[PDB]
Each structure stands twice: as C-alpha cells, then as structure tokens.
Ligand binder design. Structure first.
Ligand SMILES: CC(C)C[C@H](NP(=O)(O)CNC(=O)OCc1ccccc1)C(=O)N[C@@H](CCCCN)C(=O)O
Ligand SMILES: [Ca+2]
Ligand SMILES: [Ca+2]
Ligand SMILES: [Ca+2]
Ligand SMILES: [Ca+2]
Ligand SMILES: [Zn+2]
Length: 316
C-alpha cells in the first residue's frame, strides 16, 4: 500500500519485545519499506486461502496474542533479507529485490511452514508438536531459503536433489540464526518444537541420528515417503556442512573445521554457480570442492576440509 514508513513495537511468539517496520495509511500495516521492494505480512485468518489480508493494526502496537506470529514472521524475514544482502550481496530471493510476502495463522492446528512457489506460509501448530512456527528464526530463514534455491539452482524436490534442497534450507536457516546471535545452535526448529519437552528439536545437524536421520550415505533412505526422504537424507548433507564448519572425527574420518563464515561462502557459491535442478550428492561434493577452490585455492585447507567432510559422510 502507499503510505509513510513507521516503526511499531510488539511481542513475538516467545514473549520478546521488538520493533517492526510498518506503513501508515489509515491503519498501520505490516509492510516494511526499508528492505528492497518491501516485506509484507498477511493474516490468513485460520483459513487456507492465500495470501489473506495485508496485516492491519489500528495503533502500531502489536502485543496481542493473535499478533505474535505476525510480529515474528515480519521481523525474521527482515533479518533473513539482511543476511543475504550483507553477507552474500544478494538482494532478496530473486537477486532483484522481489517483494517478500508471508502469511500467518494458516489453517487450524497446522504443524508446518512452507514456501508455496510465491510466498511463505506459517501454521500456528497444534500447541503440542509446534507453537506458531514463525517464532523460529531458523524456520523463517529455512522457508525464505527455499525461494532462493528455486530462483538459483532450482533443485527438484525429490530424492537426492530434494535432500540437497532441504539441507541448503537447514544450513542457511542455521547461519541466519547465528547471524542474529540469539541462542544459536546447529539444531532445527528448537524454539517452536514441542513446548512440553525441553532440549529437543525437529532435526539436528550436529548429530542427525539423534532424531533417526542418516549421518552417512550408507544409511540413506531409498523409499517413497517424504518425496523420497527429502527431510531424512538431508541429514547426510547437514552433517557434512556441520563438519566443514566445526570439525570432528566421524566414522573414523577427521575433518579440520574452517568456521561458519567459510561454510556459508562455499555453499552459497555452490548453490548459485554450480548446482542444477537435478544435482545429486556426488555432484554437490564436486560443486563444493570447486567453490572452495575458486574462493581459497586448490591447495587450501578449505578445499581439503570439504573433501574430508564428504568422505566422512560417505559421499564420493
Ligand atoms: C523447518 C521446519 C519447521 C519446516 C519445514 N517445512 P518445509 O521443508 O519448507 C515444507 N515444504 C514443502 O513441503 O515444500 C513443497 C511445496 C509445498 C507447497 C508448494 C510447493 C512446494 C520442514 O522441515 N517440514 C517437515 C517437518 C514438518 C513437521 C513434522 C516436513 O514437511 O516434513
Ligand atoms: Ca494494536
Ligand atoms: Ca537456537
Ligand atoms: Ca536452531
Ligand atoms: Ca521442545
Ligand atoms: Zn524445507
């Protein structure tokens, strides 16, 4: 909408106060004009018709319980935009400052979030498996990263290419969580998963097997559930990424860690310069090796560590 840029204040899903960029035109709308061609947050009103209505508020204060998922979807989309722009020189998901749109309060009891080809969508959860999923910064960045993937490598959402697609979203979701630097970890979704159980998460990158996901190619899932295991076999790539950054010895193979920033540079370059819609795990290894060679040189520790990490998870 046309209006003037304003700054509201509200509380997110976890009860924390934050400022949010809004737009005033009769109402105050969740429309942040400070980033690209805007970040826009919509109310789906417990229905499944998208996007719903651009979020309107009478007083620019967003402290109601119903407001909390919108505050966080809007704010964390801004953090994710900032990460891509400041760290990777990428302007929104398409590289051309496309408007970023999210809807919250999608459906009833909906235990998921997704990119639908055009926008982000967040359930409220059922209060048992999830609370409203935009409360997780890694979740928000996971969803926006699907849009980045779709505009770049275009990884098809099935089998190995789909597991790479998933791992890319978990990797950058985690790197955005570290960028914001509030309780960062290598776990996925811990801030919104299972409110009655402490210390768990939906997936772990440091130890995928903790939640039944493979940590070695020999343990890959080859059935048809979950689009051929896209959220399962992602554990193999997530583990490799964790090892590249943090190091470790895994199935007897030692990896020298090179840190998060270099991990992000290598995988961003792989995603945007080398991967294709049909890339498999072996082709990802090659893309990561070439990316690290471009950035750091063929004789670098960074290249050697990429090779070590893929060896450790059984990907040649
Ligand atoms: C980070 C977590 C909290 C959310 C994440 N969701 P996602 O991977 O973005 C889902 N996207 C997807 O299915 O895209 C395909 C698509 C859809 C519409 C239009 C076009 C294309 C996820 O891990 N979901 C799991 C766990 C769900 C909880 C158990 C899962 O679905 O099995
Ligand atoms: Ca209000
Ligand atoms: Ca965390
Ligand atoms: Ca996390
Ligand atoms: Ca929990
Ligand atoms: Zn995903």
């Amino acid at each position: 909408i046309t209006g003037t840029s304003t700054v509201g204040v509200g509380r997110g899903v976890l009860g924390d106060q934050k400022n949010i960029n809004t737009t005033y035109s009769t109402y105050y709308y969740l429309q942040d004009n400070t980033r690209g061609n805007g970040i826009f947050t919509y109310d789906a009103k417990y229905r499944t018709t998208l996007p719903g209505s651009l979020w309107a508020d009478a007083d620019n204060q967003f402290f109601a319980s119903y407001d909390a998922p919108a505050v966080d979807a809007h704010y964390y989309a801004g953090v994710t935009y900032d990460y891509y722009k400041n760290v990777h020189n990428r302007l929104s998901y398409d590289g051309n400052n496309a408007a970023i749109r999210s809807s919250v309060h999608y459906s009833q009891g909906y235990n998921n979030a997704f990119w639908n080809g055009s926008q982000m969508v967040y359930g409220d959860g059922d209060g048992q498996t999830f609370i409203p999923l935009s409360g997780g910064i890694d979740v928000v960045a996971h969803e926006l990263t699907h849009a980045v993937t779709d505009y770049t490598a275009g990884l098809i959402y099935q089998n190995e290419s789909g597991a790479i697609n998933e791992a890319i979203s978990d990797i950058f979701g985690t790197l955005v969580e570290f960028y914001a630097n509030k309780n960062p970890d290598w776990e996925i979704g811990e801030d919104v998963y299972t409110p009655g159980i402490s210390g768990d998460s939906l997936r772990s990158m440091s130890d995928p097997a903790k939640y039944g996901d493979p940590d070695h190619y020999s343990k890959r899932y080859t059935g048809t559930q979950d689009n051929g295991g896209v959220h399962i076999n992602s554990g193999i790539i997530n583990k490799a990424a964790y090892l590249i950054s943090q190091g470790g010895t895994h199935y007897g193979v030692s990896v020298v860690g090179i840190g998060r920033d270099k991990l992000g540079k290598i995988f961003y370059r792989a995603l945007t310069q080398y991967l294709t819609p049909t890339s498999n795990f072996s082709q990802l290894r090659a893309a990561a090796v070439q990316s690290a060679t471009d950035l750091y040189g063929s004789t670098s520790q960074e290249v050697a560590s990429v090779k070590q990490a893929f060896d450790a998870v059984g990907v040649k």
